[PDB]
Amino acid sequence: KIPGYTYGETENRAPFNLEDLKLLKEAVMFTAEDEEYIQKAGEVLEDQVEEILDTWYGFVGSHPHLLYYFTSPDGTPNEKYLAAVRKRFSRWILDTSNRSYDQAWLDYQYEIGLRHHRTKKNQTDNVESVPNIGYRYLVAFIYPITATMKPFLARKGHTPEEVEKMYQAWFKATTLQVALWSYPYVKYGDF
Amino acid sequence: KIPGYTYGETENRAPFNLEDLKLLKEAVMFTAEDEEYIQKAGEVLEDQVEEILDTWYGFVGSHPHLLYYFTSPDGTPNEKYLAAVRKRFSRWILDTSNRSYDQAWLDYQYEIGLRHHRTKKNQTDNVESVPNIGYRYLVAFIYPITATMKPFLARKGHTPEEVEKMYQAWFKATTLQVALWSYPYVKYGDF
Numbered sequence A, B: 001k002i003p004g005y006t007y008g009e010t011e012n013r014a015p016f017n018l019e020d021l022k023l024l025k026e027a028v029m030f031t032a033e034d035e036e037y038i039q040k041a042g043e044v045l046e047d048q049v050e051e052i053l054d055t056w057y058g059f060v061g062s063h064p065h066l067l068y069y070f071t072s073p074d075g076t077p078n079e080k081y082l083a084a085v086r087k088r089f090s091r092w093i094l095d096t097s098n099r100s101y102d103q104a105w106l107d108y109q110y111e112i113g114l115r116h117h118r119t120k121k122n123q124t125d126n127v128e129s130v131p132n133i134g135y136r137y138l139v140a141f142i143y144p145i146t147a148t149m150k151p152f153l154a155r156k157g158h159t160p161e162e163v164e165k166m167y168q169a170w171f172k173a174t175t176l177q178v179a180l181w182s183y184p185y186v187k188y189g190d191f
């Protein structure tokens, strides 16, 4: 029901598999305990998803060199572009929470990588905009994406310890995903 | 006095400048306030640097697909490789704390990127080892590098809020650096 959202119906197999994923879970110190807590993160954020997106887009719109990546060629924000991506972004909050990180998940990670990269940016929504998001910012955004989240994890009044556990699980999953999304950016053989 | 440590004597200008740096700072939400806590972070960690490195190498050593990047071709850890890098790693804890992030700093960021990449890996210490560290792990390590650090920031018995501030400043600086280190990995024009 979400236009452009193709989880489980992607054209490509990811170039990484569940063996790659396990080693790389290990590199970010992600275990079964984080599965439980990322899932608990979802139940807690699910309600608040609108406010979260406003927090996030309000940080994005605040910074012209960041808003830039949603702009029409004339410099003005493409509002169709913003609204469509927003729906798919909101769904990723829940996917990160609720999906098995199996091969269909990996296939979508690869896809999300391709859509930030020049390979597939601007094709999902059929818009004219900047061709590529500099990978430097994909990495940088790990910070605000985790930050932005933490206050929201506190709002159903969970213990600070449980909030800390959901925040760490989230920090790890975001780091894990951004690391996968670098594939189409990274010189072949260097990934 | 630290062999291979060439901060301020690198042979290349970085391909990024202080204008690039200001916009990346902004992407990771790093401000003057973080300057004052990263500097505080240094005073707090300075003492404990031995123990920190043991924690970090003990995480590295316990994962064979991670230890791998310090191995001789026969699979055994190169001990002359580990010890030399350890000295330069320990200095980076203090550089991140104390340096002005100016052009000489950026030039060294580029260098550190080059040394993880095939471009320069294994030349500093004149060792034979694996040619390249897959960028996926540079990104992944943002997590353990921040997590490792947090307990150490608590040890001089600072209040949790000051500890929270030093930890965030550290999370941001590590994210900022790893984003810069991706340069030699990323397809030209995609950075």
Ligand code: HEM
Residues within 6 Å of the ligand: A004, A005, A006, A060, A066, A067, A069, A070, A085, A088, A089, A092, A112, A115, A116, A120, A121, A122, A123, A124, A125, A133, A137, A138, A139, A141, A142, A145, A174, A178
């Ligand atoms: C932690 C880093 C990031 C996360 C977690 C993230 C998250 C997302 C998600 C979930 C989508 C929707 C994917 C889909 O189902 O189609 C998306 C698309 C997009 N994001 Fe990001 N993103 C990150 C970095 C960035 C950065 C640095 C920018 C620059 C402002 C950005 C701007 C965009 C744009 C323009 C699209 C649409 C791309 C296209 O045309 O398909 N993202 N992002």
Ligand code: HEM
Residues within 6 Å of the ligand: B004, B005, B006, B060, B066, B067, B069, B070, B085, B088, B089, B092, B112, B115, B116, B120, B121, B122, B123, B124, B125, B133, B137, B138, B139, B141, B142, B145, B174, B178
């Ligand atoms: C947040 C991510 C990382 C940080 C903060 C970091 C930190 C450092 C530092 C400060 C140095 C010394 C640079 C110098 O002055 O020469 C170094 C070198 C090195 N690190 Fe990392 N590193 C990261 C990712 C990784 C990963 C994923 C590995 C894989 C185990 C790794 C293994 C190595 C190796 C093998 C060298 C020596 C490279 C050479 O031959 O010059 N690092 N790293």
Ligand SMILES: [Xe]
Residues within 6 Å of the ligand: A052, A056, A145, A148, A149
């Ligand atoms: Xe977010």
Ligand SMILES: [Xe]
Residues within 6 Å of the ligand: B052, B056, B145, B148, B149
């Ligand atoms: Xe560390």
